Symmetry: C2
Subunit: 527 residues, 2 copies
Amino acid sequence: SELLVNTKSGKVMGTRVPVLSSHISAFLGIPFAEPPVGNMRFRRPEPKKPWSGVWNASTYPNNCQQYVDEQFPGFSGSEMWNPNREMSEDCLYLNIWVPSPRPKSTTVMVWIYGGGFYSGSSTLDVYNGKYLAYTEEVVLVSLSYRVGAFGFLALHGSQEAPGNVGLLDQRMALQWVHDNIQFFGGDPKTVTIFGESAGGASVGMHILSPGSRDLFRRAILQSGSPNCPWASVSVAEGRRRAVELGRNLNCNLNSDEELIHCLREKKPQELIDVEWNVLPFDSIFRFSFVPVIDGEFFPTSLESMLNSGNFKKTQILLGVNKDEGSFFLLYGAPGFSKDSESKISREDFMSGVKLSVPHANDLGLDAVTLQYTDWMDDNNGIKNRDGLDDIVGDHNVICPLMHFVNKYTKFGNGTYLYFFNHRASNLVWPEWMGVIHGYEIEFVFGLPLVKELNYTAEEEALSRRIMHYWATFAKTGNPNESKWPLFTTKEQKFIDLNTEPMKVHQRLRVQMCVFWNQFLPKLLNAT
Amino acid sequence: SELLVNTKSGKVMGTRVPVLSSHISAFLGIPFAEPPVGNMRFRRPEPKKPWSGVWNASTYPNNCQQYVDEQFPGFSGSEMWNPNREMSEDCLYLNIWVPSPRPKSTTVMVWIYGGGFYSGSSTLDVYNGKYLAYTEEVVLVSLSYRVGAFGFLALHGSQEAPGNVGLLDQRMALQWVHDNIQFFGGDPKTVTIFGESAGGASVGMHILSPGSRDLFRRAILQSGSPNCPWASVSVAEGRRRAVELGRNLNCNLNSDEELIHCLREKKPQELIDVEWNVLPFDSIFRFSFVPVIDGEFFPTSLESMLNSGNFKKTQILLGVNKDEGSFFLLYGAPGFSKDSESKISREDFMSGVKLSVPHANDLGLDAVTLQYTDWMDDNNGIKNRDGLDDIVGDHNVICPLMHFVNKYTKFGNGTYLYFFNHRASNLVWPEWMGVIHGYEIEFVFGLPLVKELNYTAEEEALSRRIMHYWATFAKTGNPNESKWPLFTTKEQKFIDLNTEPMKVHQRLRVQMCVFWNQFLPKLLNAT
């Protein structure tokens, strides 16, 4: 039967799913690790014991335990990101969409969800792999991983909560694909990992980490990169936050053993309830439990790894959205609101810069302010709001990504760069937020193809192009079969991604990124 | 007789001079101080002993001893600034142009020459007062003052070379005008001092200095301001340079008395020959012997004087030229030459920034470079040359002047601001240098009115306007009789000065001047 697959872990029974008036197979909820529960909380994952019988893979699995956004109750703009299944610590499952009839050896794409390493679900509507699997004739995988404390609590030296265990979940899933995708018709020698935001930083982390490099062929990074200032912490900072978390829960802090024991007795929601209390600064775009530079998963600092070429050499396709910061300013900066135009005073602007660059001394805060202020028109509400939006986007997403691409391009075997600037016609978030962080994903997954979702015909066209680029890149290492130019060290070309005829440009946001990647870091080092 | 004037120092005999097909009186070479020679070298000036008989005032006097520019021997662009009379330490004389017939009580204008406090002559062709005196029916005075070591050697504490003595020359001349202009038909209650570059900084210094305020009514500052980074030095730096100068001349450096004695035996040219050897940095736009913050002429730091309003409150008219830096880069920066277009490499650009900001640490040099580099086009030769031109102009002239105007405007009784951007059609300096430092003076003095000098008709028109503005301002405190708006703290308006219909703008170079006046000084204070 087309819906029965015998893998090395046991047999699995899929379900036939309708897609744009045709059908494909879906194998949902395949376990790839032992449930990370009890004494196994904060531990490295453990491979799933093979099972006899037929695993029923016809429904989506639980989503990991995570903080749940209740900012706009009922609003679809925010709720589409919230878990849509029961949460459980028993959450380590993957999902496979397979063309029909079953291929013999095709391109595989593995999606790694974002959510700031504190949230995310493989089971979201915008992540439904059936459009891309069907359209591009790829085998589409989506994995899952522990988030928040469960995924990233770090007490370096201890084996009970080493840190990085959420990254090891992703790795075990990539191990299960390596070992089993062939039985689904996928080519394990032609896997692309792709992910957005923490998913893109994850993808870059598997390129860096020696124990992941061998488990995939190529990588796509959307609005994230491993060297992002929010994507990792020192072992000492990880340690300080695990201790503070236990402090919030009245744990015995005498030893790691005492701490870890106490944390393992607490219900998931107890951890989730005090999780934001451990941040060291009053900040925006900072997440409590994130990957640590442990000397294992990452042998050395990300930067020295990037300088020496200590990383998988392959092809990469990556890019950013126009207005990466608006979401974080909305949710966290004074003066921004969902239902106004959010024109920002100078007083709120300066409040915003302080939140966006928590680690900066006053001189550093002045350097930023001067770099983004139009002194001919410094009380312009719109210019203040947009300039803050760019600060957040630049510092947190664009310029880290630009640094990664430039460093990577020195040693890699082909780099394709995009700048996604189409604002979807049916976007429910206000205008001021622009081309919002995360809103290229629905184009990547082909939602503009389903009539009922209310996109224009030109949005459908753009979706079909993006998908064809991503899948052709996954297949050949080149998005091209008009032509998207290679990004090279000298010319530094990139394309815009929008409903208009392609335009090639060069040096994406160089003025600002020299400031964030060269000048400001020098400034804070000296002062 | 019209050409005979009985003053308080004795009688003086002028000479009738032709001017645009009419005539006026000129009293040239009037002494206003005792010759600063012998034991009086480096001393405060001494008022001129009255004389019996008739002083022959029919010829220009000697120019002070000064370094002589020999960069372009024969070239008129440079030689027009060189002394055109014999140099002598006996140089303290003024020149008066008086309408004919002799007025009874008219507006007086006193011109204070520039030349970086190391050079300058009252007797230059471009300073001929007869066009302005004739056209505007003003009494025009030009004074002189000691420059170089002779004017500005500073050994604070000693009375033999206190420093600032060149400023006291100007002051004695303003004292002689106060006391005697009435006999020439001038109103001593309606004197405007005006000057360009060191002449403009001088004018601002007489506004600041309590012992000068009472000797004039209003002030015009062209391309200079008292708080310019090259216009003054601490007493300690003045001291270090007088000692170094004596070191260059093998003086006994045991005491000030030994030093000063040794310096007074040297011929003028011996001092002039080693004068540039005392600068502390490899720099551009820095002059060895300049005014010192002595606690006498200037009671406190210029800045604390400007903050507290310790300064004459009156009306001021002031401004800058478009391309203030080009002359100093020409003469002193690698890669610029008179007969090429001077496209600058990045290597020369960075060499230029270091020379332009000698007092900056590496971080400071990076801050400058980032502020003036187009990172989308950083090897553009023209953009590098122009960006260096702006660095020099901004740091040295425009932004100091913008700081002075803003501070002054808080307490003053009316501020008129201009931006002079017409490049003269008959300019002999190359194109790349633009609207060159100093080239508004010939418009101020009405050279475009003499046919033989080869200006266009619209240049003559602009000259007539500038002159009418300067003289109407001198007369009433308002350049207006289309309308040049007052510069106010809020609106910060200014006009361009060119052959085109007037345009009012606001906040002259604010982006750059926040950087030079606020950010960079903070940067170097912290590092």
